[PDB]
Write an enzyme that holds these catalytic residues in place. Sequence first.
Site, PDB file in Angstrom:
ATOM      1  N   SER A  27       0.863  -1.144   0.000  1.00  0.00           N
ATOM      2  CA  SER A  27       0.000   0.000   0.000  1.00  0.00           C
ATOM      3  C   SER A  27       0.899   1.191   0.000  1.00  0.00           C
ATOM      4  CB  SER A  27      -0.813   0.031   1.257  1.00  0.00           C
ATOM      5  OG  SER A  27      -1.718   1.100   1.225  1.00  0.00           O
ATOM      6  N   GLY A  28      -1.552  -1.746   6.140  1.00  0.00           N
ATOM      7  CA  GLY A  28      -0.434  -2.659   6.052  1.00  0.00           C
ATOM      8  C   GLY A  28       0.208  -2.811   4.690  1.00  0.00           C
ATOM      9  N   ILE A  29       1.452  -3.261   4.687  1.00  0.00           N
ATOM     10  CA  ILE A  29       2.155  -3.578   3.440  1.00  0.00           C
ATOM     11  C   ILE A  29       2.085  -5.082   3.150  1.00  0.00           C
ATOM     12  CG2 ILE A  29       4.296  -3.150   2.106  1.00  0.00           C
ATOM     13  CD1 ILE A  29       3.085  -0.569   3.509  1.00  0.00           C
ATOM     14  N   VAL A  30       1.812  -5.436   1.894  1.00  0.00           N
ATOM     15  CA  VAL A  30       1.641  -6.839   1.489  1.00  0.00           C
ATOM     16  C   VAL A  30       2.788  -7.364   0.620  1.00  0.00           C
ATOM     17  CG1 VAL A  30       0.250  -8.415   0.044  1.00  0.00           C
ATOM     18  CG2 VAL A  30      -0.869  -6.984   1.770  1.00  0.00           C
ATOM     19  N   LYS A  45       1.266  -9.988   5.290  1.00  0.00           N
ATOM     20  CA  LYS A  45       0.829  -8.625   5.550  1.00  0.00           C
ATOM     21  C   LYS A  45       1.476  -8.111   6.835  1.00  0.00           C
ATOM     22  CE  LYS A  45      -3.491  -5.982   5.371  1.00  0.00           C
ATOM     23  NZ  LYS A  45      -4.916  -6.194   5.002  1.00  0.00           N
ATOM     24  N   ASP A 141     -18.576  -1.464   3.429  1.00  0.00           N
ATOM     25  CA  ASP A 141     -17.554  -0.951   2.506  1.00  0.00           C
ATOM     26  C   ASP A 141     -16.973  -2.058   1.611  1.00  0.00           C
ATOM     27  OD1 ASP A 141     -15.801   1.970   2.438  1.00  0.00           O
ATOM     28  OD2 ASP A 141     -14.870   0.229   1.481  1.00  0.00           O
TER      29      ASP A 141
HETATM   30  N1  LIG Z   1      -3.780  -9.273   2.693  1.00  0.00           N
HETATM   31  C1  LIG Z   1      -3.786  -9.830   1.676  1.00  0.00           C
HETATM   32  C2  LIG Z   1      -3.874 -10.473   0.508  1.00  0.00           C
HETATM   33  C3  LIG Z   1      -4.122 -11.845   0.454  1.00  0.00           C
HETATM   34  S1  LIG Z   1      -4.149 -12.212  -1.157  1.00  0.00           S
HETATM   35  C4  LIG Z   1      -3.870 -10.741  -1.829  1.00  0.00           C
HETATM   36  N2  LIG Z   1      -3.790 -10.467  -3.171  1.00  0.00           N
HETATM   37  C5  LIG Z   1      -3.919 -11.336  -4.084  1.00  0.00           C
HETATM   38  O1  LIG Z   1      -4.140 -12.513  -3.870  1.00  0.00           O
HETATM   39  C6  LIG Z   1      -3.821 -10.888  -5.526  1.00  0.00           C
HETATM   40  N3  LIG Z   1      -3.073  -9.651  -5.747  1.00  0.00           N
HETATM   41  C7  LIG Z   1      -3.502  -8.413  -5.402  1.00  0.00           C
HETATM   42  O2  LIG Z   1      -4.521  -8.207  -4.750  1.00  0.00           O
HETATM   43  C8  LIG Z   1      -2.701  -7.204  -5.850  1.00  0.00           C
HETATM   44  C9  LIG Z   1      -2.075  -7.449  -7.220  1.00  0.00           C
HETATM   45  C10 LIG Z   1      -1.346  -8.770  -7.156  1.00  0.00           C
HETATM   46  C11 LIG Z   1      -0.138  -8.938  -7.834  1.00  0.00           C
HETATM   47  C12 LIG Z   1       0.533 -10.158  -7.771  1.00  0.00           C
HETATM   48  C13 LIG Z   1      -0.003 -11.209  -7.029  1.00  0.00           C
HETATM   49  C14 LIG Z   1      -1.208 -11.036  -6.351  1.00  0.00           C
HETATM   50  C15 LIG Z   1      -1.882  -9.812  -6.404  1.00  0.00           C
HETATM   51  C16 LIG Z   1      -3.730  -9.808  -0.821  1.00  0.00           C
HETATM   52  C17 LIG Z   1      -3.458  -8.355  -1.033  1.00  0.00           C
HETATM   53  N4  LIG Z   1      -2.860  -7.892  -2.139  1.00  0.00           N
HETATM   54  C18 LIG Z   1      -2.788  -6.555  -1.952  1.00  0.00           C
HETATM   55  N5  LIG Z   1      -3.330  -6.232  -0.747  1.00  0.00           N
HETATM   56  N6  LIG Z   1      -3.772  -7.415  -0.132  1.00  0.00           N
END
Ligand SMILES: N#Cc1csc(NC(=O)CN2C(=O)CCc3ccccc32)c1-c1ncn[nH]1
Length: 331
Positions: A27, A28-30, A45, A141
């Site tokens: 963005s 927490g950071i994932v 996360k 939301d």
């Molecule tokens: N927490 C958590 C998460 C559990 S799964 C997940 N995201 C995904 O599964 C899929 N995904 C995205 O969504 C952002 C774009 C992306 C790029 C590469 C691989 C997965 C994703 C997230 C997440 N991605 C970004 N913020 N949160």
Amino acid sequence: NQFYSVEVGDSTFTVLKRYQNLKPIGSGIVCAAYDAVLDRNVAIKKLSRPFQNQTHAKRAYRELVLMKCVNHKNIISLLNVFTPQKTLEEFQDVYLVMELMDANLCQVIQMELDHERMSYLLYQMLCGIKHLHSAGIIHRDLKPSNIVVKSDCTLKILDFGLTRYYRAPEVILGMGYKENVDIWSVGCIMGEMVRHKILFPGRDYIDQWNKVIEQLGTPCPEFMKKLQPTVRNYVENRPKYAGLTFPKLFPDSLFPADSEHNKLKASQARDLLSKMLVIDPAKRISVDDALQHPYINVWYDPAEVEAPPPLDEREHTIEEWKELIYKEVMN
Ligand SMILES: N#Cc1csc(NC(=O)CN2C(=O)CCc3ccccc32)c1-c1ncn[nH]1
């Protein structure tokens, strides 16, 4: 010691040694990493001092408790929860390791969708929403950026609720709500899958309501009187709009309708939008009834919908919060 430190952009991820080759999607950071124990990809996360404020601490605790509580194929599951900090005095970061998918729902809105895949995606969103409503949880939301997609196309939901383009009139106008408040948010996502433009793109709450009445029209008098009189004053004062019909909102060219199957499915789609994108929640279709709509019901599965359903909402000081989350991280 079990952990290892790795630098990722701004923050330092100090995760376990089982998780390797981290890749940022924050963005927490994932981070997206490979779990060596489970032999599969995961999503990490980092909750940076999540007890920093009541808004942060309340949601993070909400996301913690519910994910290990709920278990559905349309609401993402927890696989591992951990923290590098040994004591409470040292406690600073919470890592939520959870199931990884392929893409975001925003990435999908940039594409042309056949009815088969689209109606299946929407079906899935309804399944999770229904199952959340059976636990007594109303999302409110609901947004595409908070919905994840696999190359399947299977759908899962990231958050549990409570950029604002998808909030319902009653949420916007502080009326109070019910279950079917999530049917509005779906109608916003569905219509965006069609237009590819965001349906009601308002810069502020007041500005966003204008973009609702311009297209749908000023709601019925019967609806008006149920508002806060102080707020009701403002809405009754705003200009009157006849409200454009749904064929005019979603014209022929938007839908894939080259075959007879597609031509029929196009009207079935618009018939659904027309029932979901209603301003008065008393006239807006319910989740139960929406899954029975000819466009959606072709996917119906009781093993998914009628699955078994599974504490308060209180204030806490950030000293009180710390311990609360640490308790539920140490489980
Ligand atoms: N927490 C958590 C998460 C559990 S799964 C997940 N995201 C995904 O599964 C899929 N995904 C995205 O969504 C952002 C774009 C992306 C790029 C590469 C691989 C997965 C994703 C997230 C997440 N991605 C970004 N913020 N949160």
